[PDB]
């Protein structure tokens with residue numbers, strides 16, 4: 001079987017993408033952020049502290065005939081940006097774009113950080129990293145992808161994120177009409193639980209391609225591109241008036257500048273990120289300083305190929321026994 005769901009940016013800057021997901025019987029539809037950098041399916045619920053909910057749609061397990069409390073199970077998670085959430089755990093039926101999994105762990109948020117509360121468009125997260133990162137204790141739970149794998153035609157899902165436009169998450173098949181040329185596959189390391197791979201180098205604008213190994217993760221749940229300081233410095237050196245700002249928290253640039261493209265390597269292939277994708281607009285309303293979409297990973301400790309990079313490509317997450325990552329131009 002297969003599934004296919006449209007994913008929509010939550011705002012005019014593509015800060016995150018939401019995808020409708022059916023939970024429970026009868027279906028309760030929530031808009032979840034599909035996150036290949038985490039492995040928990042957690043949702044705002046009727047159990048979330050009332051003051052911590054501001055316009056989100058909430059999952060109500062008491063109205064689902066298929067919901068079952070997973071007795072004794074708790075979850076607690078903290079994301080790389082400082083966000084956090086925790087609660088108890090139900091099992092229920094979960095469908096994405098026609099693909100249905102029964103008995104999926106649905107982690108009901110009893111407490112959520114302020115970052116999630118103030119984002120009324122995101123009802124929760126659907127983790128698509130490897131199940132070894134799932135935070136449910138004492139019995140670790142499987143992701144939606146892991147539970148669906150056996151019934152999928154192929155153990156793959158693809159991310160086709162749009163630039164200021166809706167996109168598609170497909171499960172179980174590869175849409176050969178959604179990309180140009182060939183797909184280049186590269187090996188994945190699962191040792192940290194991420195879709196971790198090694199880029200073969202980079203180029204700035206029309207400059208020469210620098211062959212160098214960049215280890216990083218493919219993360220749909222991260223907005224920007226986080227690369228080593230040496231690469232990020234070489235990119236922003238080409239932008240007139242760009243500088244790293246300690247008060248803003250990263251590289252900013254005059255909103256009047258035009259940004260060069262950024263090219264990253266996938267084996268022998270090249271993926272080009274247009275300069276317009278790296279513009280994240282004024283740092284405050286009316287400011288003439290704009291925020292850059294390529295930032296340094298030095299504070300984070302791992303390089304992150306977030307949405308800025310992934311939306312320039314058609315990306316295959318091949319979850320075979322030897323996992324691989326496929327990239328194609330589109």
Ligand SMILES: NCc1ccc(C(F)(F)F)cc1
Pocket residue numbers: 035036037038079080081219220221222300302304
């Ligand atoms: N979007 C999930 C996510 C967030 C942060 C990290 C970090 F910071 F640990 F790399 C990994 C994955």
